[PDB]
Amino acid sequence: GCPDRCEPARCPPQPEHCEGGRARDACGCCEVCGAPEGAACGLQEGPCGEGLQCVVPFAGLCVCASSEPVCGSDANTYANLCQLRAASRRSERLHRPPVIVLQRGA
């Protein structure tokens, strides 16, 4: 049940960082925290964060829209870019800098 036009002055204030990254609400109006990879999404559970797609049997689960390994600014290779970005947010949460992408798996 969405109004035909987003009402921005009604949008809730947000935390500096979100566990599963950023997203929009179901009306595509306000910025909200999105569900992380492997977390429940849809209806009550809310949207997946950036780079994640809500998948359902043909409630859902968030999966990374990309599936290829990536090498970050640390030594650690990440199973996908969603996991690299989460690690980066956790690092920023505890006041460090981000984990940036170097190449792809190597």
- Minimum Å distance from CB 68 to Cl ion? 14
Residues 32-51 that bind Cl ion (CB under 5 A): none
- How far apart, in Å, do the first and last CA atoms of the chain sit? 47
Whose Cβ is closer to Cl ion: residue 21's or residue 72's? 21
Instruction: State the CB neighbour count (10 A cutoff) for residue 6.
Output: 14
Q: Whole-angstrom Cα distance, residue 8 to residue 30?
A: 7
18 is an interface residue for Cl ion by CB under 5 A: yes
Contact yes or no for 88/99 (Cβ under 8 A): yes
Contact yes or no for 80/70 (Cβ under 8 A): yes
- CA-atom Rg of the chain in angstroms: 15
- Minimum Å distance from CB 55 to Cl ion? 5
24 is an interface residue for Cl ion by CB under 5 A: no
70 is an interface residue for Cl ion by CB under 5 A: no
52 is an interface residue for Cl ion by CB under 5 A: no
Q: Give me the residues that bind Cl ion (CB under 5 A), please.
A: 17-18, 21-22, 55, 85, 88-89
